[PDB]
């Protein structure tokens, strides 16, 4: 390199010109972005208490719905197990006749 470097350098000047053009377009860095916000919060806010209790109860309701569906699945699987175990208990009564012969 170090020869005919104009082809590479003039590109940077063109980029500077396009940077100025874009700053004119919408702006490069927004002037004085969020310098001051002095609004003092309320002591607590009735609506903030309502939102806190709302979160508390909504999380609870969602968890409760999920747990209720889980418990329903549990009881259904449990009744299926009860029936299957009744039939397995008939089979095991046959096996118990065999085990009594064995004893």
Partner 1 sequence: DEVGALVFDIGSYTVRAGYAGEDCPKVDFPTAIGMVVEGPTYYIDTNALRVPRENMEAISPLKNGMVEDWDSFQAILDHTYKMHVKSEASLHPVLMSEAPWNTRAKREKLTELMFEHYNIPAFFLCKTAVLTAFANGRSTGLILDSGATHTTAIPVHDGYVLQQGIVKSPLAGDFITMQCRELFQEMNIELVPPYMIASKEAVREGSPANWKRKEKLPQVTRSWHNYMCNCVIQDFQASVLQVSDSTYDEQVAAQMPTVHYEFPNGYNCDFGAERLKIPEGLFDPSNVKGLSGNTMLGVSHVVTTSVGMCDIDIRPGLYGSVIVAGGNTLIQSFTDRLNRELSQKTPPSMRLKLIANNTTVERRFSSWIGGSILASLGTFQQMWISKQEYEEGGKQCVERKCP
Partner 2 sequence: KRPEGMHREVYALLYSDKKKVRPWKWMPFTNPARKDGAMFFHWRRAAEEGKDYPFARFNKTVQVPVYSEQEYQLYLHDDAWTKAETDHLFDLSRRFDLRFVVIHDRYDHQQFKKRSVEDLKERYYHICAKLANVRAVPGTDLKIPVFDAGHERRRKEQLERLYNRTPEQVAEEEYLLQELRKIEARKKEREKRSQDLQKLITAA
Partner 3 sequence: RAKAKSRSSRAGLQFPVGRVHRLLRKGNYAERVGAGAPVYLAAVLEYLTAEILELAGNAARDNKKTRIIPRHLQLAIRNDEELNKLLGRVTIAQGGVLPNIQAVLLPKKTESHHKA
Under the criterion CB under 8 A, does residue 68 sit at the interface with partner 1?
yes
Q: Are 22 and 28 in contact (CB under 8 A)?
A: yes
Interaction of residue 55 with partner 2, rule CB under 8 A: no
When asked if residue 94 is in the footprint of partner 3 (CB under 8 A), the reply is: no
Q: Work out which of 61, 71, 76, 95 binds partner 1, going by CB under 8 A.
A: 61
What is the CA 30 to chain-centroid distance, rounded?
Answer: 33
Told to check if 17 binds partner 2 by CB under 8 A, we report no
Task: Report if residue 67 touches partner 1, rule: CB under 8 A.
Answer: no
Q: Which H helix or E strand runs over 56?
A: helix 46-102
CA distance to 24, 36, 41, per residue, from 33 (Å): 17, 9, 21
Contact residues for partner 3 (CB under 8 A)? 67, 70, 73-74, 77
């Amino acid at each position: 390199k170090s020869h005919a470097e104009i082809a590479e350098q003039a590109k940077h000047e063109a980029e500077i010109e396009t940077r100025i053009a874009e700053l004119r377009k919408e702006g490069f860095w927004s002037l004085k972005r969020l310098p001051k916000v002095p609004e003092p919060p309320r002591p607590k806010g009735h609506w903030d208490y309502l939102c806190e209790e709302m979160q508390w109860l909504s999380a609870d309701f969602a968890q409760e719905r999920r747990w209720k569906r889980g418990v329903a699945r549990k009881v259904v699987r449990m009744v299926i197990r009860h029936h299957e175990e009744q039939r397995q208990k008939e089979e095991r009564a046959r096996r118990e006749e065999q085990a009594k012969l064995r004893r």
